[PDB]
Design an enzyme around this catalytic site. Structure first.
Site: not given
Ligand SMILES: CC(C)CN(C[C@@H](O)[C@H](Cc1ccccc1)NC(=O)[C@@H]1CN(c2ccccc2C(F)(F)F)C(=O)O1)S(=O)(=O)c1ccc2ncsc2c1
Lengths: 99, 99
Positions: A25-27
């Site tokens: 996860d690059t984000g």
């Molecule tokens: C938002 C981003 C700036 C930060 N996030 C990393 C993301 O890649 C996160 C990683 C992540 C993935 C899945 C669940 C929870 C978190 N993704 C998402 O929130 C969205 C949710 N979603 C998602 C999931 C299921 C159905 C539909 C969606 C949709 F796509 F949404 F429809 C999806 O596909 O990506 S994080 O998880 O909150 C995160 C991780 C490490 C971290 N370290 C410090 S603060 C911090 C925050």
């Protein structure tokens, strides 16, 4: 390896005696793993994402193997729905984004 | 470009003639942008992230240029903590993970 993004970039990771699937996860600044009872010292922390914040336990210098590549560093443990390999470990296994 | 991960993979995007900074986010299925105005019909949607569920507006077939690479796809608009470019558009610009 090259991993395309047609699907979620889930890979097998190992942390001691537990093998788990986790997102490359690059984000994610930090590595966030679903609840597990790791040995050693930790500190409480709150991390924020979509929907708000969760409370996690920060464990330091935890070795994790990712597709057979060795990593060691900080792992956050908490009530996440997915295991997240963040940039702190992605860099250690030589991961880049390319287009 | 090749992008390393010691820093957040933040890039300039162009959307509706506006320039914004957004995070290339392999852990995100979908592209989610902070509050903004886009034209045309949208539909209410709910999505779940690490901290719970939020309401967003779904706009379809929106052009975005990401580092000069053109995409046209779905953009969700709502209270994300950061503008995120998800896999729906990362695939369009040919982005992969490599290590
Ligand atoms: C938002 C981003 C700036 C930060 N996030 C990393 C993301 O890649 C996160 C990683 C992540 C993935 C899945 C669940 C929870 C978190 N993704 C998402 O929130 C969205 C949710 N979603 C998602 C999931 C299921 C159905 C539909 C969606 C949709 F796509 F949404 F429809 C999806 O596909 O990506 S994080 O998880 O909150 C995160 C991780 C490490 C971290 N370290 C410090 S603060 C911090 C925050």
């Amino acid at each position: 390896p090259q991993i395309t993004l047609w699907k979620r970039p889930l890979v097998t990771i190992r942390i001691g005696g537990q093998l788990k699937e986790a997102l490359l996860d690059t984000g994610a600044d930090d590595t966030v793993l679903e609840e597990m009872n790791l040995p050693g010292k930790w500190k409480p922390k709150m991390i924020g994402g979509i929907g708000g914040f969760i409370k996690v336990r920060q464990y330091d210098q935890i070795p994790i193997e990712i597709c057979g590549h060795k990593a060691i560093g900080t792992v956050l443990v908490g009530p996440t729905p997915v295991n997240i390999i963040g940039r702190n470990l992605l860099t250690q296994i030589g991961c880049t984004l390319n287009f």
